[PDB]
Amino acid sequence: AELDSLLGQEKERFQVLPGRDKMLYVAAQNERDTLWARQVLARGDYDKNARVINENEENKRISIWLDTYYPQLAYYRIHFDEPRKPVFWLSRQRNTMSKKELEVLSQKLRALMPYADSVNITLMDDVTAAGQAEAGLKQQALPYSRRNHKGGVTFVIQGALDDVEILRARQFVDSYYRTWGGRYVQFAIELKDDWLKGRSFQYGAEGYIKMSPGHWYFPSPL
Amino acid sequence: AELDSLLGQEKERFQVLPGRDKMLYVAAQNERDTLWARQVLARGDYDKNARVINENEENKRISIWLDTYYPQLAYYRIHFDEPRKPVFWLSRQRNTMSKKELEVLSQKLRALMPYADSVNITLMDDVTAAGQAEAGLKQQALPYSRRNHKGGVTFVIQGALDDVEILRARQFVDSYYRTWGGRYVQFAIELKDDWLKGRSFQYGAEGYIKMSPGHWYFPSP
Amino acid sequence: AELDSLLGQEKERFQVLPGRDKMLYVAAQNERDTLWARQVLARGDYDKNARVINENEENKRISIWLDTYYPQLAYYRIHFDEPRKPVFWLSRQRNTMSKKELEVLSQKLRALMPYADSVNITLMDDVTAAGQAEAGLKQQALPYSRRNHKGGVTFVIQGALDDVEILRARQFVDSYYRTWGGRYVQFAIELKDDWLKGRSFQYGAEGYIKMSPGHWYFPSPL
Amino acid sequence: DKDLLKGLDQEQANEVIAVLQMHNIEANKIDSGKLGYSITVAEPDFTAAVYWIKTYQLPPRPRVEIAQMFPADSLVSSPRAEKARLYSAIEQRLEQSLQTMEGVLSARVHISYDIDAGENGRPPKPVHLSALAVYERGSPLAHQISDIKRFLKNSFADVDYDNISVVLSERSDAQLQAPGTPVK
Amino acid sequence: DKDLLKGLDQEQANEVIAVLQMHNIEANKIDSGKLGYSITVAEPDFTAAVYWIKTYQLPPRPRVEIAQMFPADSLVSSPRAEKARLYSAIEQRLEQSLQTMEGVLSARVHISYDIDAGENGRPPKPVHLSALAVYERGSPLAHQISDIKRFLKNSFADVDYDNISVVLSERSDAQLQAPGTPVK
Amino acid sequence: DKDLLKGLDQEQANEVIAVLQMHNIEANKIDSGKLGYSITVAEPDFTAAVYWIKTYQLPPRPRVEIAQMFPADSLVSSPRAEKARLYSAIEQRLEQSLQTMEGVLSARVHISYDIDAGENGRPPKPVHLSALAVYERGSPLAHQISDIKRFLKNSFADVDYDNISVVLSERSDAQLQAPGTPVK
Amino acid sequence: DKDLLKGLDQEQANEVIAVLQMHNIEANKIDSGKLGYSITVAEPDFTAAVYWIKTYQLPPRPRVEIAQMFPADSLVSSPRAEKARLYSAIEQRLEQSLQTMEGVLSARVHISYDIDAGENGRPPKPVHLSALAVYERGSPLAHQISDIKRFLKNSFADVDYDNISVVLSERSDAQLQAPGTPVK
Amino acid sequence: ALSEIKSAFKIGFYLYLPFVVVDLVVSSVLLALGMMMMSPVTISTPIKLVLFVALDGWTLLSKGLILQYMDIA
Structure with missing residues (x-):
């Protein structure tokens, strides 16, 4: 049986992407459908290999690789609306990259995601x-x-x-x-x-807190 | 049988639209009819594929695409009073768009709505x-x-x-x-x-509230 | 099994109108008779399709269409004293539509109601x-x-x-x-x-002064 | 023939039938001897009749009175339990006298209760009344406020004309024709 | 054929049926004589029906009233229990009188319980009321908030129009059509 | 075929099934008459079903209330016990009255308990309220927070708008499709 | 198949299997009839299962509550034994109410108890609260701490925001796959 | 002063009530035996006296009487 028929009746919430490393990625969109798809692959009623991807999980996973191979980078988010051509929002007023190493980064990010065909880098x-x-x-x-x-x-x-x-x-x-x-x-x-719940105080550059009608406290200038 | 016969007795509160990607769309108008029509397709008494659309969560879906591919865009609402030609209410004094890229935005919204034929964009x-x-x-x-x-x-x-x-x-x-x-x-x-339910107070320029015969409250302006 | 016979014995509190879109409309009068006629079309003791209309809810339905295609329009009410020829009460002093774009409005209001014959627009x-x-x-x-x-x-x-x-x-x-x-x-x-039913005064040196209408009211000891 | 209620009372089944018959569905009242009546409805009308049972909260609870919380067979009766059993019978006698007027079909009166003025030295306060009525239609129900207010104003020791509240209304349209059998 | 609930009550089974029939799934009310009713749904409609049982908290618990916590069969009865048994019969009689107005389908009234204020030497505080209502649709429910305040303003000792809060709403859209059997 | 829970009652079994069915495992409820229900799962779904039993703390324990710690069957009843049996019946009646609003499926109300003010000559403190609610989705739940505050403000002696905290939330996504039997 | 434990409980055996299946060793929930449940592991997995029993302190003790050693069955009860039973039912009802929030799998609430202030010449101190919670993952659990402190603030007489400490955490990883039998 | 003699005499009857139950439950167990003639007062007073101090009586009404008047403790 195929993978898109081994899931539930509504064949609209999941999307099966043919991977390039001889695998098969299923793309849910929340953490409840991710456990709905991971239960099928974990009980083992499918022959070949398959993985379940997400939006928040894959965007947290790719920042661990980027925090080792490209430190001091100013980026925002990877957007996965179309899961074959993701968009990488990069900062403009903070990077020191020319047009060559942006193509190098757009090829090394393509090698991290085998389901994608091309990664688009836009400068917000x-x-x-x-x-x-x-x-x-x-x-x-x-x-x-x-x-x-x-x-x-x-x-x-x-x-x-x-x-x-x-x-x-x-x-x-x-x-x-x-x-x-x-x-x-x-x-x-x-x-x-x-702060200073029921206490009367004398604020500004020479301050005190009236702990009582006859008690002055002199902390930091309130 | 057909999809409009598997729904309820009264064939007026549901509209069945033919798609473009070989799918069928049921257009409910509130949440009670959306959960009424989703039980039919969920229990599985229909052969081919079908979806249930709405007014609210279809305006919620194409704002997620529209805050990624077209940010900083000033618009109001996408009206579905007739579902084959929706109206897009765009703003007039806050956009920087010419005649061409409004037509490209119309063509990119038609691809997002497969049940529609055209999208009419007006400026308010x-x-x-x-x-x-x-x-x-x-x-x-x-x-x-x-x-x-x-x-x-x-x-x-x-x-x-x-x-x-x-x-x-x-x-x-x-x-x-x-x-x-x-x-x-x-x-x-x-x-x-x-505060001034039973209290006496002076209003105007020099305002205060007498919380007691021996108690003044000077509120901050 | 005609539609006027599937209703009650007294055949003078309902009125069946033939439609243009091949559908028969039953025009009730109040909310109590609309559910008396909706039970007949809900239990399914009739062959073809039919709809039940009402004066109170066809004016609520036509205003949802009207405030999307004709905004900033000033009007009062639609009267259905003769249901095959309604009257649309438009405001004279608050809109400047011409004769031709009033006849276009009268034809687009006619295509919304398949039981009517000609909508008559009067300027009140x-x-x-x-x-x-x-x-x-x-x-x-x-x-x-x-x-x-x-x-x-x-x-x-x-x-x-x-x-x-x-x-x-x-x-x-x-x-x-x-x-x-x-x-x-x-x-x-x-x-x-x-005890002063809305009006309020203030007293000084010349008599009473009628105050401006406002939201704060003085509670009355009396 | 699907039953929806059983074990009901005589006055309860007449309140279930008169609600279902108003909304174009017909019901059968079936006696069962000692186990009360039972109401059955037809199969195309079962979906509507369950919705009107849920909406109108049928079957009706029996109507409560304040003199039932303080039964007279108790050995110790407080001054509070005697003043409450006094007012709970004046409240019923006044709404039984309001129905003999010219045009009233039903009525309901509410007397304000005073309890904690007797045990302590606090003086009592002014007593407040409130009323409801259903009038036969075709009647001028705006002029009949002063007759009920005049009758209620002199049945207690100290009431004012702005301490009496009367809210009344005309009856509904009559249901005279039969529901009709659902053909198929 | 799969059983959902069993051992229910007559008034408890018509609420589960009135909830399941709103969401396009059928149910069968099977009597078992002494053991009560039971409700069964089909096997394609078992996954949705358990979800609506869990969400809507079915079966409904019986409605609680304050006079049940202080029963009349007690050997001693403090004035705290006599005032609580009195106020709990006034707020039942007032909500039985609100259902007889023109257009009201159901209602609910709450009284502010102040039990120790009349006991102590401090004077008793003001009494607060609050009411909810469900009106027949087609009604102008903005004007009817003043008739309910006029009705229950003069039913107590000294209430103001600021100590009465009425929150009311119109009923839902009617469910009249049959659900439909699952075809396989 | 392996069993994981036996002896459960009806309300416990319908909340174990509704938890497992949203995590793509299918359970079977088996009646046993006097000994209660029992829940059995398949063989590949046992390692995951034990993990969700442990995580979700299933089976659900019965919900506790303050009126159970002080039963009305005692020969002597302290005023701390009569006030604790009064406030626990008011906070049950308030949450049974909140479900009759427009869109509310569940609610839970808490009242601050004051018991030591009556025993000695101290004045009582102000009374605090706190509510939770679950709404139908598609509703503007930011403007629904003013009606629960207006309803809750004058259901007691004297509260403010700073002593009422309402935390409400829309309901979860609907589960309507069947889980799916594992092939082998 | 050497035996490990016996004489356990239905909930005491579901925690032992849930602990052993996390560490890649299988177990068998063998029923013993009238004795109870018994867990048997394989012979190569016996050393690891004994070590994880000793480390995780299994079998679990029954969870204690404060109202378990001040039972309501005695003919006389001190005010010390009535305030500890009132507060022990409040800290359970607040725990039952915290689990119905959006995302919480489990929670635990502690309240500061009052002992000496009933008889000493001091007024009673302020109330201190403490809460734990386990959230479903994917939650921005830095913003959830303002919805629990707001709900727990005015459910008592007067607590501050400094006297409430909430320590919450996301749940662990999911266990779905089978352990696997030893290849012998 | 007339409101304090009134407020004291109906407290002392409530206090009177348990003791009557005691000397009516110890005088009836003698007549169940062959003790129809022995005097029950000399048996009633020790069984009434060792119960009131063991249940801490004189520190229960001395607290409950001063709690009416002032903020004690």
Whole structure:
């Protein structure tokens, strides 16, 4: 029996790709269909060899090879919408590569994925990656605090947030990491109470905390 | 038998479209009919291949392709009031596209929708999109605050709202998300309790709240 | 087994209209008779196909089509007092369509309804719409607050109303919504606890000053 | 002939049939001696009749009264259990007198309960009433607020005209024709 | 032919049938005399039916009320148990009276239980109510939030219009057509 | 053919089958009358079925409630026990009333318990509520959080909007296709 | 086939097989009749199975709860023995409620118990909570810690965000393939 | 003062109730034997006295009486 007929009735969720190293890759799109396809190949009701690939798993696997053979590289994400010609989003304002070694990298990345035929490398701009991250964080009316340093920005969302400001701040981060990756810009949601809870303090460059009506505490300038 | 005979008795709430890749498409219109038609194809009383499409999760599918191959694109919604010629509502004041690459985007959307024959792309202004959202929010007599910025607009609804206004708001936001979608203008209804229920206070320029006969509260501007 | 015989004994509360797309329409009147006729077509004691229509839900169905192909259009209601020839009440003072693009709208509204023969478009005035809502609200001796804005008008009825003023207001809004519809003028009946039924004043040095209509109300010690 | 309810009461089966007959499906009431009645429906109508059992929460629970939580056969009766059994019979006698007016088919009255004023030194407070009614159609149901309010205002010691709340409505359209047998 | 549930109740089997018939799978109500009812589905429709049993938490537990935790057969009865048995009969009678309005199919009313406030020397606090309702569709359900507040505002001691919260909605689309047997 | 669980009851067996069937292994429920059900799997699916029994902690233990630790059958009942049997019946009635909303399939409500305020002369603290919910997919579940807050705010004495935390989520993807028998 | 264990439980044998199958050695769930279950391993796999029994401390003890040594069967009960039974049912109901979140396979909740404050001259201290959780992989489990602290915050009288510590982790790798018999 | 004598006399009856059960359950086990004539008071008072201190009585009502008035402990 064939592999596309050994899976379930709905032959729409899985996609069988003929590998080049005499194998056969099945491409699921979440972790529940990955275990649905791995149970068939693990109970052993198929003769030849086959593997189950994914989006997040294969994008985590190829960064271990790239963190050894190409360190200090500024990239974002590998996109697998068409699993035969994947797109590699590379940074523009941070690399020192000419047109020759980009073809060398596009051939060594092709040798890592036997199901693909050609790897397309497109150079995404570096400022719009934080411009979309700030403009999407302002439409949800969320308080935030941007920190700029070289090779990555950081948005801190703290304080006592209500239940609408947690549910709105989670659906945006999970919709942004899905299309940009967590390599460049990092969100830091941190639900905690207010510092100096019921204490009156005298802020700014010469500070104290009133522990009581007759008790002064002198820590760091609040 | 045919697919339209294996469905329910009333042959009106389902539309069977012929595909282009030798597949059949059933176009439900909500989630209850989508789960009604998926039990037929899942239990397997049909020979060939068939799929069940929708209005929401088909607008969700071709935005995943459209945030990879066409990023930074300003659009609103893909309307399926007739499923053989959908309408693409693109923005006018935020695109940099000429006549040619709109036709190439139309040809790349026709390949994404195999049940369709053409895709009609119209351009809508961003003034009427934020004007109908403010005039409708003013007609229901709701307290609101508008925050304009580039590439989006947000309306904030705060206060101690009663049980009539949280139903008038929900019937308007649900009637507006169906037409325009949440790509441009976003509503933020959060309700808080009021402090000045039984307190005496002075409002205006120099405002304070007397929380007690011997207690002043000066709120921050 | 004819369709008019598969309905009830009294053959004067239903009306079977022949269609253009080879389908018979049963035009009921209210929600109680629509499920009385839908049970017949659901149990399947009829050979061919048929549909059941209604005045309340063919006006909700035609507005989903109308606010996609003809946006920014000002209209009130569609009346189905003669179901083979409906009347479409358009606003005169808020649109500038010509005669030819009104006949194109009248033919595209006709192709949406296969039971009709010719849709007749009449242009209603816009002053008498908010005029009959004020003159019918002064006749019941109800307190109200007219709020005018561009393209609509709203009447707010607040206060601790008694049991007769609630009955007369609810009995009047349901008789006005049937004629005009809630596209232009909207009513805002709401109960809260203040003996001044909506109006508020401030007192200093000259008498009383009528304050502006606002959202904060003073709770009444009385 | 598929049964859907059995073991029902006499007044419960008349509430199930009058709900199903309103929606163009016919039912059979079958007596079983000691085990109550039973309602059967036809095979093309079984899908609709299960949906109206789920929607209308049928069969109906028996109607509750406040005098049932404090039975009179108990050996120790509190002042709270005597004041509640007093008001729970004034509340039934008032809704039995509201049905003998000119045009009322059904009615329901609610008296406000006061319990924790008797044991302590706190004084009692004003008593509030509330009413519901169903009037025969063709009647001017706006002028009949003042007759029910006038009748209720003088049946207690201290009530005001803005402490009485009457919400009433006209009856539904009559169901006079038969459902009809499903042919195939 | 595969069994899903057995030993059910009459009111418990019509909810499992009313849930499975909404999702295009048939069911058979088989009586077993003394042991109760039982519900069987087909073998192609066994994988979906176990999933909807797990999701919808079927079979339904019986509805809990506050007067069951303090039964009347007790030898001693504190005033905490007499006030809890009293408020738990008022919120059952008020939700039985809400179902008789024009258009209401079902409802549910909650009272704020304050049991120690009248015992202590501090004055008793205000009483809060809350109600849910399911209306017949085609109704303007924005105007009907004021009749329910007018009805249950004057049924207690001192309530305000800010201490009453009514959350109501229209019913679902009707299920009238038959599911259909799996052909193999 | 190998057995992995025997002696399970009905609700435990229907939640072991619904867990294994989504991980592409097929189970068989076998009744045994008095001794309960039993669940058997095939021979290649035994190493994986034991791993999901261990990971998912199956069979499910019965759900516990506070009203079970203080039964009403005791001869003496402390006020800590009467308040613990009262709040545990209010938080059961509130979650049985949340499932009657539009789109909710499951819910779970928690109330803060205060027991030591009544024994001595301390004033009581404020009361806190917390809810969970599971919604139908396709619903805008950001605006559904204001109706549960408005419903929950005045079902008690005096709460704020800062003491109510609602965490809700859409349901999982539907499992409708059969698992598949292993060929050998 | 040398024997390893006997006299076990249905859940005590499913943990031994789940431990031994992870380390590439097979087992046999041999039933002993009225004695219980018994696990027999092969002769070349006997040294490894004895070493992994000694290391993993198998068979598992029954899990303890705090309300197991203050039983409700005694005729008298201290307030110390009634607060520990109330808190031990709260920390179980919160554990049952945490498992119905999106992605959680298992969880465990601890509450700070109160002993001396019933009789000492000090007011009772604040409440401290502690939670563990195991998440399905693929989850961004740095953002899940704000949905558990928000749910656990106002389920009590007054806890802070500093008094709640959540330590959670993704689950281990999947075990699906068979161990394999020794080639002898 | 008249509200405190009233609030004390109905607490002392509740306290009275277990003891009556004790000296009615020890006086009836003698009549089951051939002890119809012996006086049960000299048997009732030790079995009532060793139970009240072993169940810690005088530290249970001294706590429960002061908890009505003040925030004790």
